A paper describes a structure:
PGM5 shows a bi-lobed structure with four domains arranged around a common active site, forming a deep cleft between domains I–II (residues 1–195 and 196–308) and domains III–IV (residues 309–425 and 426–567). As expected, all four domains contribute to the active site with one loop per domain; loop 1 (residues 119–126), loop 2 (residues 292–297), loop 3 (residues 379–384), and loop 4 (residues 507–520). Herring PGM5 binds substrate similarly to PGM1, but lacks enzymatic activity.
Furthermore, we have solved the structure of the most common PGM5 variants found in the Baltic and Atlantic herring (bPGM5 and aPGM5), differing by only one amino acid substitution (Ala330Val), and explore the possible functional significance of the mutation. Crystals of His6-tagged aPGM5 belong to space group P21, while crystals of His6-tagged bPGM5 belong to space group P21212, both with one molecule in the asymmetric unit. Thus, the ion was modelled as Ni2+, which because of IMAC purification is the most plausible ion that fits with the coordination distances and electron density. Interestingly, Val330 is involved in a crystal contact in bPGM5, but the corresponding interface is not formed in the structure of aPGM5. An additional crystal contact is made between the N-terminus and the ordered part of the His6-tag, while in aPGM5 the N-terminus is involved in a less extensive crystal contact. Thus, crystal packing shows that Val330 contributes to a protein–protein interaction surface in crystals of bPGM5 that is not observed with Ala330 in the crystals of aPGM5.
Numbering used by the authors: -4 to -1, 1 to 509, 514 to 567
Amino acid sequence: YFQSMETNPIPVVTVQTTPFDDQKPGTNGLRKKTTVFESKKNYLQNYIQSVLSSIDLRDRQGCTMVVGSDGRYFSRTAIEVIVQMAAANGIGRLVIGHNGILSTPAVSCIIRKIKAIGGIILTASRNPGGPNGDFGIKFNVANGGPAPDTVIDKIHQVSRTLEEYAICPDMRIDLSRLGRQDFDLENKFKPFRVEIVDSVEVYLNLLRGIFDFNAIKGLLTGPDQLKMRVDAMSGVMGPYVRRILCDELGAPANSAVNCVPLEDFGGHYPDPNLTYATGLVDAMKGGEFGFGAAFDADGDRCMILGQNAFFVNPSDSLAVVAANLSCIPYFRQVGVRGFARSMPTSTAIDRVAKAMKVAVYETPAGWRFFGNLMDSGRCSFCGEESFGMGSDHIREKDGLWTVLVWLSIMAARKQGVEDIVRDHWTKLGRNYFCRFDYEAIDPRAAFYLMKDLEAVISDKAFCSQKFAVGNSVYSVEKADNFEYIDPVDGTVARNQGLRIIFSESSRLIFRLSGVGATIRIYAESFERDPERHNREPQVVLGPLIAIALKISDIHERTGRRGPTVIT
Ligand SMILES: [Ca+2]
Ligand code: NA
Ligand code: NA
Ligand code: NA
Ligand code: NA
Ligand code: NI
């Protein structure tokens, strides 16, 4: 028994609604066109309710949730609705970033730091922002990582059947002022608490214990200072770059580019790659900078560029960092438990894992599966070919972490980006790698393309086949439709990519990702000869690409005669 006082209690409102059929989140949350969440009636409310209902009402009552966004248009409105419906659903406290700004890694860090039950991240990553752009809602769980396939099924089940939802429509929240905002609610004893927190502080504190900030600051300052351009692409990472790389680590202000978060990302796709980070590439090509980097909208993906815009392939970045973790105080003290990569990612890191005698895991695309490997201590470091890298310091990929680990390696090795990569190739060989994206193709054609290709590579005699393109020859070693049985919780992921492994240390992978679908073709060829480590990837891999387009017959089936994007 307890007694207390209230003043002007905010009422709770129940609303009759109708379920939607498509409110199941994908691998990176539920993404729709912004107008769907903004104007389709009760669409936003239905999904927030379903997300909150996926938490046991006894664990839910009096719990804490973290909320953050990448800053895109509509984020503030979604946050307000989220606050009004968390209050109405018995949530004890919300920790929200200043101005609604929290990077995906920061959310993951804060969830774990304060032992929250989970968090909602409002981001559509690389996809454009604005009224006619895209909007997404990610849900992370208590370990700070993406929701497992089991919680997704729960969220879906509730969304299909949701008949009502609860909300406090009269509640208003000010995201601009740091500090606590308590609310007396009808039928709630304890006041409902909203903490507006600095977007960067707690996340920065985590990094300060991981890295040697003195070594990094020495690299960025002094007469022999690294000249550097870091482009947050007008997304969430702006304040993180300024507060951490400039203020704390001493980088000059002109190193921070597009570091004002914008609701439309400045009218550009917040996608860190050679195709869309054209401003960074043009600056790096001038030859004036020894290090470049771009982040995506929510700050978990990162492109690394060397002097003269030397492109560090994400699969090479993974292997290079894995081979130099000893340069980092964190890993010197806690050790390296194991590595993990998504199956489409190049096998470069596998060669590092072999030399170091550490386990390497091969997972489906998506960070969901790295989390169990980290939670169980099987893995300490992992990454994906899609510009993603991370460690067990959180349960999300981390772009700024990727920059700091690279700077730490450069400072400790007294070398630039290109020399580190080329030395790495000399030591272990080079895994030539590229990815073709065929975007927004007829999902009907995509279906039959994969169905037919799966039948081809599954034929009994396919392992006895060999292919010739010009003077090059490739002999099928094994081929399958990739499957992953989670070694921790037993989750089974089927149809995770068609894979052809050739005898001549080469691979082809086919993955099927609005209405349209995306087919991704990955090609990999290993080169041991150190004198053949400066060929153009499209030349080395041309033959394998030709095989891919032929056996898949993608150009005919889709009417395209070329990929949309090449990485
Ligand atoms: Ca064979
Ligand atoms: Na994300
Ligand atoms: Na994305
Ligand atoms: Na508090
Ligand atoms: Na991919
Ligand atoms: Ni992202």
